[PDB]
Amino acid sequence: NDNIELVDFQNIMFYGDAEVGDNQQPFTFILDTGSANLWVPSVKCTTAGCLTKHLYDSSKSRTYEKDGTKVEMNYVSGTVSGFFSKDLVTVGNLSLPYKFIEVIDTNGFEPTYTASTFDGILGLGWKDLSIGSVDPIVVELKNQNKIENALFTFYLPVHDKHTGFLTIGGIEERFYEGPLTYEKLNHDLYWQITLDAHVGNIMLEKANCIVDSGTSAITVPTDFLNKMLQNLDVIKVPFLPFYVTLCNNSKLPTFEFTSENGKYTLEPEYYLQHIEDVGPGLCMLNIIGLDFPVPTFILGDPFMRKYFTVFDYDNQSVGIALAKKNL
Numbered sequence: 001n002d003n004i005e006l007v008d009f010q011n012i013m014f015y016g017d018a019e020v021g022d023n024q025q026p027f028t029f030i031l032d033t034g035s036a037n038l039w040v041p042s043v044k045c046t047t048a049g050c051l052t053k054h055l056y057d058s059s060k061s062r063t064y065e066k067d068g069t070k071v072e073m074n075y076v077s078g079t080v081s082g083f084f085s086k087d088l089v090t091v092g093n094l095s096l097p098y099k100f101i102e103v104i105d106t107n108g109f110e111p112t113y114t115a116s117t118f119d120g121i122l123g124l125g126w127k128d129l130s131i132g133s134v135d136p137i138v139v140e141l142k143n144q145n146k147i148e149n150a151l152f153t154f155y156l157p158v159h160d161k162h163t164g165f166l167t168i169g170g171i172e173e174r175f176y177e178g179p180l181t182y183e184k185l186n187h188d189l190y191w192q193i194t195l196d197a198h199v200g201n202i203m204l205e206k207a208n209c210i211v212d213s214g215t216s217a218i219t220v221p222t223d224f225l226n227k228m229l230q231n232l233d234v235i236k237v238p239f240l241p242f243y244v245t246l247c248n249n250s251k252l253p254t255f256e257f258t259s260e261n262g263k264y265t266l267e268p269e270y271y272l273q274h275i276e277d278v279g280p281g282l283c284m285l286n287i288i289g290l291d292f293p294v295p296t297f298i299l300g301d302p303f304m305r306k307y308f309t310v311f312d313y314d315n316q317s318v319g320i321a322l323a324k325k326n327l
């Protein structure tokens with residue numbers, strides 16, 4: 001099993017480095033289990049955002065194969081566009097020829113892009129979620145017998161305490177304590193599982209829960225959120241879907257998610273973000289209201305900071321265990 005060290009940025013997201021090109025051109029990635037394409041900004045990029053970034057130069061790579069098919073990647077937080085290219089992609093010490101998007105326009109991905117220090121996004125989703133039918137990196141690696149299992153694991157960094165690791169091809173007991181519980185996927189192409197969701201007396205039976213490394217909140221159905229916030233002494237920021245609270249607000253609830261197999265809780269300490277700068281003793285909730293057609297929670301970064309997670313393509317399941325507080 002190889003692994004990629006995960007560095008914290010502002011206790012809100014984390015990044016890992018990988019390389020694209022036969023000359024070791026190094027890039028910082030958001031590692032996103034909710035998307036299925038890899039992209040890097042190109043030397044051909046003519047946007048303000050690209051100015052600050054590590055850029056990909058295919059002319060300097062002898063393993064570069066031209067594709068040139070045009071493509072737009074639309075995310076909830078914005079859009080990037082360019083064209084497909086193929087080159088050798090190196091993750092940890094493993095590599096494979098791989099198809100990815102060479103990005104020439106990032107103006108539709110502002111203000112996210114220029115505000116953060118990542119260069120690109122490396123998707124870790126399922127094939128049918130990809131534009132252009134790209135087999136996921138971990139599936140290809142397994143198929144090429146470079147790893148033991150078509151699986152990867154997230155041991156997330158904890159700001160001012162330890163680094164994290166993305167591990168490819170196998171599970172390591174050092175990352176977690178207690179039992180590891182596998183939850184079957186309820187969807188063909190999302191890392192989504194079925195859990196009963198409880199927050200106080202508010203309950204949602206057999207909710208869709210998407211375990212997602214690229215989202216820096218817990219998302220909650222908007223009706224469920226409105227019920228949670230009733231008489232909670234929290235205040236919404238003008239123009240933005242964020243709520244502010246005293247950090248030691250005694251009413252802040254604990255999320256409890258349950259299956260047949262297990263029980264996962266998320267206490268206020270994991271979903272609060274200190275904002276001492278805005279005022280003393282104030283926190284933002286890392287919780288946003290979001291309605292999917294079917295009632296869904298996204299168990300983002302705040303969930304994965306507490307819980308070590310195993311993404312298993314072969315067994316179409318997500319393993320969940322309490323992350324070790326330190327290595």
Ligand SMILES: CCN(CCN)c1cc(C)c(OCC(=O)N[C@@H](Cc2ccccc2)[C@H](O)C(=O)N2CSC(C)(C)[C@H]2C(=O)N[C@H]2c3ccccc3C[C@H]2O)c(C)c1
Pocket residue numbers: 030032033034035036074075076077112121128129130131212213214215216217219288298
């Ligand atoms: C079915 C169509 N399709 C396939 C096209 N052939 C397709 C393709 C893609 C890439 C899809 O994912 C789009 C996407 O942006 N998916 C995101 C997850 C998501 C979030 C909210 C609602 C739905 C999904 C994706 O994983 C993700 O985390 N992304 C996309 S860019 C990013 C910065 C890495 C991050 C993101 O926006 N994060 C922000 C975010 C997002 C939600 C709430 C809070 C915050 C604060 C930030 O953390 C979806 C949902 C469908």
Ligand SMILES: C[C@H](CCC(=O)NCCC[N+](C)(C)CCCS(=O)(=O)[O-])[C@H]1CC[C@H]2[C@@H]3[C@H](O)C[C@@H]4C[C@H](O)CC[C@]4(C)[C@H]3C[C@H](O)[C@]12C
Pocket residue numbers: 076077110111112240241288290
């Ligand atoms: C994904 C949800 C819901 C979006 C939605 O309600 N989608 C349907 C409406 C119709 N659309 C307008 C999208 C038209 C196209 C689809 S249509 O089917 O109509 O053709 C939207 C609503 C509010 C959005 C956040 C805030 O901004 C603040 C912040 C800004 C940064 O920059 C990026 C991060 C962040 C956290 C945002 C992320 C995300 O983005 C959110 C959660």
